[PDB]
Each structure stands twice: as structure tokens, then as C-alpha cells.
Design a protein around this ligand. Structure first.
Ligand SMILES: *c1cc(-c2ccccc2)ncn1
Ligand SMILES: *c1cc(-c2ccccc2)ncn1
Ligand SMILES: *c1cc(-c2ccccc2)ncn1
Lengths: 114, 114, 114
């Protein structure tokens, strides 16, 4: 899976080991090996949520399968928990786009996963 | 509605009030309360459009419904209008990718909108 | 095509003519005029791939119109090739999401391509 978070929370407020915590948690939740999980955190963004510049996050999780209603609710609880606990972002100021990628539509190591 | 603009225009050239103006205008255009709207502007990017590093923008608009031919033409007029007026980017150097999101595939406040 | 690369490689490691090279290579590869091609490179990112902060890249390629397994494999070879040669990123640490956009879902010049 690939998880991306953009946030107006400053770089200094992202704790040491945050990317490794995301990776571990996503491995558990998706059932995919940690070795293939990609994570990307973008602090200091110029963003607003509901017209407010209070802390917020705009996120995406791309996965080949493992995407659907119940699974997505679970990822949201996990991911909002993490952002709240670690970045001090209110869960109601977090949007996460979930994408079910087709294996043919993903490149890696000079080809696709088709 | 979530609107993201990535641009080579420098941060100093993004006028005060820009994220609020985006929010307000998108609220007006989508028929959604401003409380739901997320906006994100990323200046100072290393980008080229059509072989040139003149001001340009690559944007996305994600919405749960309210995406379609005529609606998208209307958004494009509005958003290119604002980018030109406020960031001095030529409309023919703006791409906006429109995404119709399923409520099940959007996380928020520990759950989804499903 | 629109090609976006996010990487933990420092900006100083991105060669001077890298945007122009991506543009040219994508034009030559897709048989498409370079005037429509957009390229965006985002260095210095806080990211991890398999829990590791060794050089990696998360990329997307958007086209209007299908890219089959054949085209996608061919793009991946080209693009990972360039990333390895120019940014010294191992191809097994590159992900590329491919998106087939509908013309009506792409805004440009105050309207859409529909
Ligand atoms: C998790 C995610 C992926 C992947 C690769 C590229 C684009 C989206 C998702 N692959 C394996 N594991
Ligand atoms: C507008 C946009 C959204 C949203 C949330 C998550 C991901 C994409 C878009 N929700 C409500 N209103
Ligand atoms: C390559 C890519 C595109 C394009 C334009 C707008 C949005 C996505 C892709 N057009 C021509 N050539």
C-alpha cells in the first residue's frame, strides 16, 4: 500500500519514527508485508479545512485490493487515531481518499504488477 | 469538495486571503457548506508545462458526486479565473483533474461518509 | 501525459535539465506533442519505502486514454530507467500509479477537453 499525508502541522511536530509507525500499522491493517509499504508525510502545508487553518490533514491510501466499505472504516479509525495521537490533529479535520488500484495500473521495478 | 493546486509560482506571490477565497468560491460553485471544503496550495514547485517553466498549475478537485461534463466546465472556468487573477497563471497552462469519489472511499472522523 | 515524481532525493541531486529530459522522453515515448506534457518533480520529501529511508520515489502518470499492460510496462521501464540514471534511485524502490482520465474530467483553459 501507499499512504500519503499532507498537513499544515510543522515539521518539528512530526515525531521521530512516525514513518516507521505508519508502516508497521499499515502492514497489520492491510495484511501486506512491511517491505512493500510506502509512506509519505508532507508537513508545513498551506491548507484550510472548513475555511480554518487549524491543524488538518489531507491523505490518500492506494492499495491493490484490500479496499471496500468495512476495510476503509477500519483504516480511517486507525489512521485518524495516529494523526490525533502523534500530530495532534482532530479526526474531524482529516480527509482520506481511498483508491483501489488495478495491478495493471501500478508500475514498480521496471514493469507493472500485472 | 477538496481542491489542491501545485504551482511553480513563488509563495510570496500567493496573495493573503487566497485559501479563504478558494473556499468561499467553491462553496458557492458546488452548493456545499464551506465547513466541508478543503483547499491546499503548494507554491515554489519544480514543474514544467509544455516544455516551459513559465507559471503553470497542476490541480485536482475531488468531490462526492457533483462531477460531470457541464459542472466540470463550470468549475474550470471559475478556478482558472482565480488562478489567472490571483496567481497570474495563464488558463492554458492549468490542468485540473476531476475525481468523483464514492462516499465509501472517503475517510473522515475515524470512519467513512458511507 | 502528466508525470509527477515525489522523492526523498535532495534537490541538489536533481540534474539541471531533468524536467526538459522528462518532457522530451515522454513526448518521444507516447508519440504525443510536448506542448501538452506536464512534469513535476518534488525532491527532499519525508518518505519511506519498505520502512527504509534509502532513496525512493512515488510517482503518477495521468493520460487521457487507456494505457494497457503493454504501454504501462513500457512507461515503467522508461521512467524507472530515468529515475535510476539521473536520481540514483533503485527501480525496486519506485512506485508509479497510472491513471486513464476521461476528457470531460480534465479541466484546462477555462473549460474541459470534452
Ligand atoms: C502496497 C501498495 C502498492 C502500490 C504500488 C504502487 C501504487 C499503489 C500501490 N504496492 C504494494 N503494496
Ligand atoms: C468535499 C470533499 C470531500 C472529500 C473528502 C475526502 C476525500 C475527497 C473529498 N468530502 C466532503 N466534501
Ligand atoms: C499527456 C497528458 C495529458 C493530460 C492532460 C491533462 C490531464 C492529464 C493528462 N494530455 C496530453 N498528453
Amino acid at each position: 500500500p501507499m499512504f500519503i499525508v499532507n498537513t499544515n502541522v510543522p515539521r518539528a511536530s512530526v515525531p521521530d519514527g512516525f514513518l516507521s509507525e505508519l508502516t508497521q500499522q499499515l502492514a497489520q491493517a492491510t495484511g501486506k508485508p512491511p517491505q512493500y509499504i510506502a509512506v509519505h508525510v508532507v508537513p508545513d502545508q498551506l491548507m484550510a479545512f472548513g475555511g480554518s487553518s487549524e491543524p488538518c490533514a489531507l491523505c490518500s491510501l492506494h492499495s491493490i485490493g484490500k479496499i471496500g466499505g468495512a476495510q476503509n472504516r477500519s483504516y480511517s479509525k486507525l489512521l485518524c487515531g495516529l494523526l490525533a495521537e502523534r500530530l495532534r490533529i482532530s479526526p474531524d479535520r482529516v480527509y482520506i481518499n481511498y483508491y483501489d488500484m488495478n495491478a495493471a495500473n501500478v508500475g514498480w521495478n521496471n514493469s507493472t504488477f500485472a
